[PDB]
Amino acid sequence: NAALNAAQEKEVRALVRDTLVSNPEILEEAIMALQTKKADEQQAQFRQALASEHDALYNDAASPRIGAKDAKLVLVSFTDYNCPYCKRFDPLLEKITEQYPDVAVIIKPLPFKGESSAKASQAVLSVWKEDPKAFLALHQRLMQKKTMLDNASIEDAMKSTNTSKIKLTDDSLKTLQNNLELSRKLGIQGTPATVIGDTILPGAVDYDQLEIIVKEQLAKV
Amino acid sequence: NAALNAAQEKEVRALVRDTLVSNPEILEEAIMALQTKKADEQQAQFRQALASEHDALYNDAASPRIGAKDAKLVLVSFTDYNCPYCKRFDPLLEKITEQYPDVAVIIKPLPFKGESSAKASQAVLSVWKEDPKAFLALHQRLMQKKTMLDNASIEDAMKSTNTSKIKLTDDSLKTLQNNLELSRKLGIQGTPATVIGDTILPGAVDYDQLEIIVKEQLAKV
Amino acid sequence: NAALNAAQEKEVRALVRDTLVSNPEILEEAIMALQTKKADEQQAQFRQALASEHDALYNDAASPRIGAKDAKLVLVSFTDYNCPYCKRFDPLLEKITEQYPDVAVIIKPLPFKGESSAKASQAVLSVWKEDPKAFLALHQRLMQKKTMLDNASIEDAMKSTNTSKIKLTDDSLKTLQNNLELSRKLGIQGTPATVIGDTILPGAVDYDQLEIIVKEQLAKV
Known about the structure:
Three copies of one chain form a homotrimer.
Chain A: H1 6-22, H2 25-52, H3 54-57, E1 65-67, E2 73-79, H4 84-99, E3 103-109, H5 115-130, H6 135-144, H7 151-160, H8 171-185, E4 193-196, E5 199-201, H9 207-218
Parallel strand pairs in A: 2-3
Antiparallel strand pairs in A: 1-3, 2-4, 4-5
């Protein structure tokens, strides 16, 4: 009919244009607010993915654990054996469980860096299931290696750790693919990726820096 | 004077800001609609480029053809002899003309991948003009080669196809530059690029997948 | 109360959405204008950075100079000895001071391309301070080298220029870091970067092209 007269309405239209164009900053405020909306959405979306797969993260038997089982705070460490930052990052992660009895870590091998991360992983898993107590040695050694993994040096590490006896089961591939499906469900794109409390860290971190985070979650009880 | 009072107008201005900022989604709807506008424009712009150069695509003599001439549906294949996907992609393209008599293909060599795509092409063109019937052999062989092209292996393929006799004419460079100007006119950035009906495909495709498209254009009569 | 009735206001809100969405171009005009705002801001921000550090650009003693000192127009040349475009670019820069007595150039070595740009630079600086007249030879030679710099070939150039006698002072590292802090203050990201009048050029340029710019600043008196 209508609620504004023709003239008024037309002027409104003109006012839109003029407002945004003569004052750009309003567009920036709108951008920022759309950004802030999308961020917040994702963050909540992660927080749900994370909260849903509690039982594959924390309660998988096939997944290797470092430190006590009862340990109040259990971290989760997505590592690739071929990833150079993981090799640098892992020792710390280990150090905390020795320093902090209440802390433990869980290992999730990922095959993205190469064929050998896959075979390596598979080995470590086979070991884990066939003999848990043994695992740490082989894990450690494989991480200690700087050079890229081949099928022999896997034998060589396995041998140098007295685990060469163990056959790579096929059951251990499921675990790999599961760590793989899992890393997708959490929208994890890279490695090392560490789960702590309700927070995830996709890179490597200084020790002192790490200690404050783990203490901060210790305080969360 | 004017069509809204000062107050009203000011409130309108304020309402712009508040609307977009308190409701980000409107900005997203506007984005999407500007995107949709630009897309549609380009698509129409391609469809014109494509429709204008009908006569260089379909009616060039210097361009090599595979299959019957009268063939109802003529595809056009922009290929680089050094491009690995083209080597994989070409055999199919050929298979259809043997399966489907109504189909033919036209070859457009492009020199972007290396000096040798240029010289190779030039050869194939020289051959095409000096002796059309011969072409297919040399084309085939050059595609069959996995290793990167040098000036000798060009001789070697030419020899293995009994075309070594033919001199690279300078007239054949025009054809190259023309295929080159043409690929620009159609905003073709990469290779393999295949023209079919009024549609263009810039990569490689499964056979079964391809058959449905060619049949779909066969139905377009 | 208020300045528009409920209905009117609601319609305004609806009008925002409809205006931007049914007419995308307004959003484009707003983009462009926000872009134009940010550009203009930066340009003014550079022009201030440039104008503030007049005294480190033009009046540093530790910085090497090519051409007369009194020279009316002094260019400034950020070059890396390992940068291939700088090697190509420098001779011209030199040619102008020989062609145009009124022109001079100042050299600012930058260490971003490699360790050897740093050591090279440091040498050239040490030389500059210990003996200014000598500098040009070593600068020239180091630029004349196509192959990447090592610690020996630095000796070799120094030797071939009869400057091997000079010790790399530690005082010359300050100059490097200063050229480094300076290049940051001007938001210089790459090399060769040349300051001329109130304008900066981050790449290499044809001679004839360069002559017009230097003449254009000569006219700016």
